[PDB]
C-alpha cells in the first residue's frame, strides 16, 4: 500500500495472509486474500500459477503483522487450491485473475469468527457500485514502488472507482482493460496498491453491506498518474465461485 494508514486486523477482519513454505525450511509471504465463508478464501490465480502445489501454502487469518505473531491469529493448511481454467497473462495484464483456497486447520476445523476474524459478503451478480464510489484496499504490500522491504504492519487505504469509459482512454490502459476488470485510484494519484498487495480485497459498501467488489490484480507502477490499480471484478465471477464452493 502506497499512502493510507497503518491498521489492524480488527478493521479488516476478512483479510487472509498467504505464505509459501520453501524447500530449505524458509517461509515467505505470497499474497493477500479474503475470507468469504468459513472454509473458503478467495485471491488471485497469478499468485499460485508458478508453484501450483497446495502443500506449499499456509494461510493465516486474524493476522496484523507480516513476520511476527498477532494474538488471535489462526493458521490453516490448504485443502484445495482452485485456479481459474481461463487464467492468462499478457505482456501487461492478467485475465480471469481469481483463485479459491479451501482452508482447514491441522485439526480439520474451519474459521471461527473472532474479534479479529470475520467473513466478507460477495456482491449480487453483475451488481457493482457507481464510478466515484470510495472503496477500501488492504495489504502488506510495498509502501513505495522503489522499496525492497515490505512493511511489518498491515495497511489500508481508500480509492475511488473509475468508469470503464475512463479506464480505457489511451493515456490510461486502453484495450488492456476489459469488463471483467474494475479500475480504482486516488483522484490526486497519491494512494494505491502495490507489489505484494495482489490477491487482496477491494471492499465497497454496496446497498448497506461491506462487499468484496474486487481482487487486487495489476496496475502499471504504484500511485502513478493516469495509471490506476486494476482489480478482478468479483460480481462477474459468482457462478464460477458458486460452482467451486457450493461443494
Amino acid at each position: 500500500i502506497i499512502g493510507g494508514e497503518f491498521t489492524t486486523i480488527e478493521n479488516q477482519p476478512w483479510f487472509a495472509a498467504i505464505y509459501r513454505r520453501h524447500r530449505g525450511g524458509s517461509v515467505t509471504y505470497v499474497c493477500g486474500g479474503s475470507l468469504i465463508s468459513p472454509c473458503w478464501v478467495i485471491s488471485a490465480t497469478h499468485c499460485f500459477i508458478d508453484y501450483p502445489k497446495k502443500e506449499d501454502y499456509i494461510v493465516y487469518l486474524g493476522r496484523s503483522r507480516l513476520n511476527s505473531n498477532t494474538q488471535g491469529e489462526m493458521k490453516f493448511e490448504v485443502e484445495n487450491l482452485i485456479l481459474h481454467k481461463d487464467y492468462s497473462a499478457d505482456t501487461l495484464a492478467y485475465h480471469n485473475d481469481i483463485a479459491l483456497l479451501k482452508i482447514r486447520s491441522k485439526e480439520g476445523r474451519c474459521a471461527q469468527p473472532s474479534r479479529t476474524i470475520q467473513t466478507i459478503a460477495l456482491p449480487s451478480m453483475y451488481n457493482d457500485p457507481q464510478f466515484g464510489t470510495s472503496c477500501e484496499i488492504t495489504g502488506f504490500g510495498k509502501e513505495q514502488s522503489t522499496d525492497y522491504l515490505y512493511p511489518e504492519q498491515l495497511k489500508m487505504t481508500v480509492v475511488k472507482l473509475i468508469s470503464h469509459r475512463e479506464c480505457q482512454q489511451p493515456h490510461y490502459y486502453g484495450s488492456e482493460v476489459t469488463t471483467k476488470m474494475l479500475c480504482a485510484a486516488d483522484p490526486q494519484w497519491k494512494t494505491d496498491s502495490c507489489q505484494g498487495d495482489s490477491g487482496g480485497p477491494l471492499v465497497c459498501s454496496l446497498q448497506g453491506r461491506m462487499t468484496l467488489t474486487g481482487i487486487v490484480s495489476w496496475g502499471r507502477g504504484c500511485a502513478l498518474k493516469d495509471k490506476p490499480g486494476v482489480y478482478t471484478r468479483v460480481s462477474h465471477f459468482l457462478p464460477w465461485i458458486r460452482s467451486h464452493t457450493k461443494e
Binding site: 509471504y29 505470497v30 499474497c31 488471485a44 497469478h46 499468485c47 508458478d50 497473462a89 499478457d90 505482456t91 501487461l92 495484464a93 492478467y94 504490500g141 515490505y150 496498491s193 502495490c194 507489489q195 505484494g196 498487495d197 495482489s198 487486487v216 490484480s217 495489476w218 496496475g219 502499471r220 504504484c222 490499480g229 486494476v230
Partner: peptide, 10 residues
C-alpha cells in the same frame, strides 16, 4: 511476468 503485475515474486 506481465509488465504490470503487483505480485511479490515479479
Amino acid at each position: 511476468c506481465p509488465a504490470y503485475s503487483r505480485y511479490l515474486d515479479c
